[PDB]
Amino acid sequence: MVPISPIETVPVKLKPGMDGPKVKQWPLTEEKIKALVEICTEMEKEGKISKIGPENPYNTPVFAIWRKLVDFRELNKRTQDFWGIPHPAGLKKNKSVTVLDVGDAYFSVPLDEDFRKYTAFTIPSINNETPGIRYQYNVLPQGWKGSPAIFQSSMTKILEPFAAQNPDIVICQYMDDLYVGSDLEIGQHRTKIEELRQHLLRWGLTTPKEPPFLWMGYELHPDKWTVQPIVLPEKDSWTVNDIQKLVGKLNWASQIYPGIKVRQLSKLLRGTKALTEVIPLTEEAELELAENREILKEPVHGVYYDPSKDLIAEIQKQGQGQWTYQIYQEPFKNLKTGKYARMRGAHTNDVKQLTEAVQKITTESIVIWGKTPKFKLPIQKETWETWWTEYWQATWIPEWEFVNTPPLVKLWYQLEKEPIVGAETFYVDGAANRETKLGKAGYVTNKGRQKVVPLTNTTNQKTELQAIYLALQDSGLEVNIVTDSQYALGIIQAQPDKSESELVNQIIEQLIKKEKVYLAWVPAHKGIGGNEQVDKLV
Amino acid sequence: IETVPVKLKPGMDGPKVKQWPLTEEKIKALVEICTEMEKEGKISKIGPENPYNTPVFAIKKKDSTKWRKLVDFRELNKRTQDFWEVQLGIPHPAGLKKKKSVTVLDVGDAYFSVPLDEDFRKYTAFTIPSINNETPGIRYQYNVLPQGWKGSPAIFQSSMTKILEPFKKQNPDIVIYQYMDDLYVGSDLEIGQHRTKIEELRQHLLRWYELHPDKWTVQPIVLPEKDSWTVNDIQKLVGKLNWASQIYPGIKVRQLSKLLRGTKALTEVIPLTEEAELELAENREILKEPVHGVYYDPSKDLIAEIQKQGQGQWTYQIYQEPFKNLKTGKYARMRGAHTNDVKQLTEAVQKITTESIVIWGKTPKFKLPIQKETWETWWTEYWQATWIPEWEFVNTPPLVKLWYQ
Numbered sequence: 001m002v003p004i005s006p007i008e009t010v011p012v013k014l015k016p017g018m019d020g021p022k023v024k025q026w027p028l029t030e031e032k033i034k035a036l037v038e039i040c041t042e043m044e045k046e047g048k049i050s051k052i053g054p055e056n057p058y059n060t061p062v063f064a065i066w067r068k069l070v071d072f073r074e075l076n077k078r079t080q081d082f083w084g085i086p087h088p089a090g091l092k093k094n095k096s097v098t099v100l101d102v103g104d105a106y107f108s109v110p111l112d113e114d115f116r117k118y119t120a121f122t123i124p125s126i127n128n129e130t131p132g133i134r135y136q137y138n139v140l141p142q143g144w145k146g147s148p149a150i151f152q153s154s155m156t157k158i159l160e161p162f163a164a165q166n167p168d169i170v171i172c173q174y175m176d177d178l179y180v181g182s183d184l185e186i187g188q189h190r191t192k193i194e195e196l197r198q199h200l201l202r203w204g205l206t207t208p209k210e211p212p213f214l215w216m217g218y219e220l221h222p223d224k225w226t227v228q229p230i231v232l233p234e235k236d237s238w239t240v241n242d243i244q245k246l247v248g249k250l251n252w253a254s255q256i257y258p259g260i261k262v263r264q265l266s267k268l269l270r271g272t273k274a275l276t277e278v279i280p281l282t283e284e285a286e287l288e289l290a291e292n293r294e295i296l297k298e299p300v301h302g303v304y305y306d307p308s309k310d311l312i313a314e315i316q317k318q319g320q321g322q323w324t325y326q327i328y329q330e331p332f333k334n335l336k337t338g339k340y341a342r343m344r345g346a347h348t349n350d351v352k353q354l355t356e357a358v359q360k361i362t363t364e365s366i367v368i369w370g371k372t373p374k375f376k377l378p379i380q381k382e383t384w385e386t387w388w389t390e391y392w393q394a395t396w397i398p399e400w401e402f403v404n405t406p407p408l409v410k411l412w413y414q415l416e417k418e419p420i421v422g423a424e425t426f427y428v429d430g431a432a433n434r435e436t437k438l439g440k441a442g443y444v445t446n447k448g449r450q451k452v453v454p455l456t457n458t459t460n461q462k463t464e465l466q467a468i469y470l471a472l473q474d475s476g477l478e479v480n481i482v483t484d485s486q487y488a489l490g491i492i493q494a495q496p497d498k499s500e501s502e503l504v505n506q507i508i509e510q511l512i513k514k515e516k517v518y519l520a521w522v523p524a525h526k527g528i529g530g531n532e533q534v535d536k537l538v
Numbered sequence: 539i540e541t542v543p544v545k546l547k548p549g550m551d552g553p554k555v556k557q558w559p560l561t562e563e564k565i566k567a568l569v570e571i572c573t574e575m576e577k578e579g580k581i582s583k584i585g586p587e588n589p590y591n592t593p594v595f596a597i598k599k600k601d602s603t604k605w606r607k608l609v610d611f612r613e614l615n616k617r618t619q620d621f622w623e624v625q626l627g628i629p630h631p632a633g634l635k636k637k638k639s640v641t642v643l644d645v646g647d648a649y650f651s652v653p654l655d656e657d658f659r660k661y662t663a664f665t666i667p668s669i670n671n672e673t674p675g676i677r678y679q680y681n682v683l684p685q686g687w688k689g690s691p692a693i694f695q696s697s698m699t700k701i702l703e704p705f706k707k708q709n710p711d712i713v714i715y716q717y718m719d720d721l722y723v724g725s726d727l728e729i730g731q732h733r734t735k736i737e738e739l740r741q742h743l744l745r746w747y748e749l750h751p752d753k754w755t756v757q758p759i760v761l762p763e764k765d766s767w768t769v770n771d772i773q774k775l776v777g778k779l780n781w782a783s784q785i786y787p788g789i790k791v792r793q794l795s796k797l798l799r800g801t802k803a804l805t806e807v808i809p810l811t812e813e814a815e816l817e818l819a820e821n822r823e824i825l826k827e828p829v830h831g832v833y834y835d836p837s838k839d840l841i842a843e844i845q846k847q848g849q850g851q852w853t854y855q856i857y858q859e860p861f862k863n864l865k866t867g868k869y870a871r872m873r874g875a876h877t878n879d880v881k882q883l884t885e886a887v888q889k890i891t892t893e894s895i896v897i898w899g900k901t902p903k904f905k906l907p908i909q910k911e912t913w914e915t916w917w918t919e920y921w922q923a924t925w926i927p928e929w930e931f932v933n934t935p936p937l938v939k940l941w942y943q
């Protein structure tokens with residue numbers, strides 16, 4: 001007998017102040033009991049478990065489905081705390097790739113001898129006329145809180161020396177599996193796989209799939225990868241759960257499939273806490289999902305990663321706060337794809353969203369490939385220059401170049417830094433009564449032009465915005481506007497090109513049509529002439 | 539040579555903090571570094587029985603192409619028991635900020651000579667991540683005093699006293715302060731003699747950054763001096779004075795606003811009256827005085843606000859309570875940052891933090907004019923400092939930007 005290398009156990013404790021679990025054993029049928037007795041007999045014969053006495057107060061309930069099923073949930077609660085799937089697009093192309101799934105994974109790894117007493121379970125005797133048979137685990141139980149961590153740590157420990165000795169190959173480990181790969185000849189490769197299996201066998205780990213591999217929702221082929229086929233449930237009644245499922249599947253498909261739009265369907269899920277309800281859909285949503293079924297018609301594949309080639313990312317504006325991206329080292333062949341939706345906000349502009357998308361893609365790319373990709377962006381260099389130079393927040397994009405693929409991201413308007421000479425000067429104000437919701441908004445100018453419009457169902461902020469808007473409507477291509485509103489100025493200084501508010505959008509539309517606009521702020525109630533709160537106070 | 543027992547606060551569990559993604563080069567750097575440290579017993583690999591984790595990354599200091607290992611100890615530092623020793627919270631050297639010049643050194647190398655308490659080691663656990671989760675991360679724990687920990691200077695403090703003992707008695711012109719892994723040395727000497735003295739101190743430590751605190755100040759509020767004023771000029775002036783009235787008691791704008799009466803074009807020149815000139819004068823005089831009743835409270839938190847002025851210009855204010863400023867300043871510094879806002883911001887945050895360490899002996903809590911995602915993505919690339927401060931994000935543009943310009 002060639003001596004087996006001992007697997008050193010991991011010391012395990014319970015949570016502080018807690019004791020081991022004690023739970024009464026459930027009554028079982030005679031057949032179940034016989035099956036359990038047989039299974040536990042052969043298991044004890046294999047050394048996986050040991051018979052114990054009355055000296056162990058702890059008990060873990062058991063069922064038979066044969067197959068023994070032990071429920072550790074209470075022990076899991078009283079057990080201590082223990083310490084993202086690999087993406088196919090990150091995998092490097094290899095002439096040979098072997099998959100090894102170790103059998104009896106958890107049962108091949110011993111359990112800390114002091115913790116074994118807490119794993120104790122009992123098989124009920126027939127007709128409850130005899131004391132139940134007592135057992136405890138000498139190895140990692142299936143369904144125990146600490147099994148996977150201990151198992152993978154042990155596996156890594158065992159794998160370390162072989163990997164150091166074999167630089168010409170690469171070994172990835174996910175949970176219960178090893179995925180090995182090399183660019184060597186198939187004979188040498190298979191030989192080294194045999195050697196690895198021998199090395200694992202040395203520690204008492206038993207090991208035996210060929211391409212295409214079906215793994216974690218993906219499909220892996222030697223030269224390419226894709227996602228397992230997506231099935232979109234078809235029903236005349238769409239529930240909340242069905243929309244969560246559908247959104248999940250569409251998000252999942254969006255990594256390989258370009259152009260997936262989840263916005264409408266996700267918008268339908270706002271503030272819904274429920275399961276079964278029938279929710280209708282707008283023509284936007286229907287056309288969206290139909291176009292999704294259109295994109296899912298002819299399947300597409302992603303390729304693998306080549307470190308010798310530049311990593312490139314390209315972004316397109318999809319409209320309505322939606323953005324889409326592709327990552328590739330070569331034309332027409334994508335490593336992967338994706339999408340970005342704008343954050344929830346009252347106001348916004350294209351440049352900010354583009355920036356956020358760039359950050360997202362950057363982080364994701366650092367996760368997957370360990371580097372930042374070069375960007376191709378639908379924005380001119382001058383536009384970005386103007387934007388970042390004149391923006392109050394600090395902002396940055398990594399190395400990038402302009403690609404012209406309309407719609408292009410642009411700056412729709414720019415406020416002057418100094419008062420305009422020759423331009424009419426509009427002093428604006430608005431005010432509202434809190435209880436009656438009655439208000440007035442208007443302006444007076446230096447040329448004698450004046451307006452006051454009465455308004456119902458409004459507030460102060462809305463009357464200030466309305467005042468500014470009135471000034472924009474009634475003025476020429478170049479205008480100076482004086483406001484006391486910190487709210488309005490705070491909105492405009494954020495430079496939105498779009499808003500939830502219709503009033504703000506009207507203001508934006510007005511600014512777009514203007515050659516020059518200078519917006520100036522003054523304190524309210526300071527007796528600054530031309531600034532009239534008295535016209536709107538009535 | 540003997541570990542001093544260290545515990546945590548009353549009911550605080552050790553840090554569990556997610557490791558953020560790292561670039562391939564930084565990962566390799568950390569692998570080489572941690573291998574060398576593993577050979578030297580500084581750190582040791584650990585198993586799954588350790589739930590705790592603290593973030594880690596790699597930086598590059600000034601004038602060096604060699605990677606340094608930076609651990610983010612903020613969570614551990616706040617969860618670490620408040621450290622009081624026989625030193626009893628050694629009083630901050632208030633003479634350090636009054637000194638002509640101050641030089642900063644990295645003494646962290648010493649910390650690795652002192653063993654760490656065995657029970658506390660489990661709290662220093664960190665993870666070296668792998669690209670694309672292909673292999674499980676490499677986890678270590680510190681056997682010795684880790685750099686970046688607040689307990690390290692506190693523990694090594696006695697040794698540091700015994701080591702610096704000869705140097706301090708030799709010249710009693712020199713203020714010596716210690717914060718984290720950095721050692722600050724004040725002097726009234728001349729830069730050449732200062733550097734020779736620095737070399738002397740360094741080789742004095744061997745046997746066992748240039749700043750100028752006197753060249754800063756507390757910035758006064760300034761008002762324009764013009765021969766002719768437009769309506770816009772006066773409107774801005776009134777806005778600024780009205781703002782400053784939250785700061786100083788007797789600022790009065792009525793005679794200046796009196797000029798603005800009637801509705802006039804913004805570019806029209808308005809001659810100043812006698813009352814208005816007198817009012818502007820009295821306002822200047824008021825602004826020349828310091829701020830009434832401004833004190834530093836060691837128990838409270840320091841708040842630092844930063845505004846982007848454009849063209850490499852940044853302004854900042856360090857305060858405790860609103861409109862009482864402990865310090866204010868401007869940062870124009872240009873080194874290789876001209877095309878990058880975030881790098882500028884990062885350097886500014888570092889400089890402000892350093893100033894705050896010199897003056898109050900503690901880092902402030904920043905409010906940054908940047909979106910969270912941008913900062914969180916790019917800040918580690920530009921960070922040259924062994925410590926890290928706290929920060930938050932202001933997403934609403936301040937109206938008060940120009941008033942500090």
Ligand SMILES: N#C/C=C/c1cc(Cl)cc(Oc2ccc(Cl)cc2OCCn2ccc(=O)[nH]c2=O)c1
Binds near residue numbers: 182222672
């Ligand atoms: N189930 C399962 C496997 C899942 C699985 C999971 C992961 Cl994280 C990796 C994996 O295979 C690889 C393992 C090791 C290397 Cl260096 C590259 C690989 O390239 C993968 C690319 N590839 C894929 C298949 C093939 O034949 N050739 C090839 O180059 C397989």
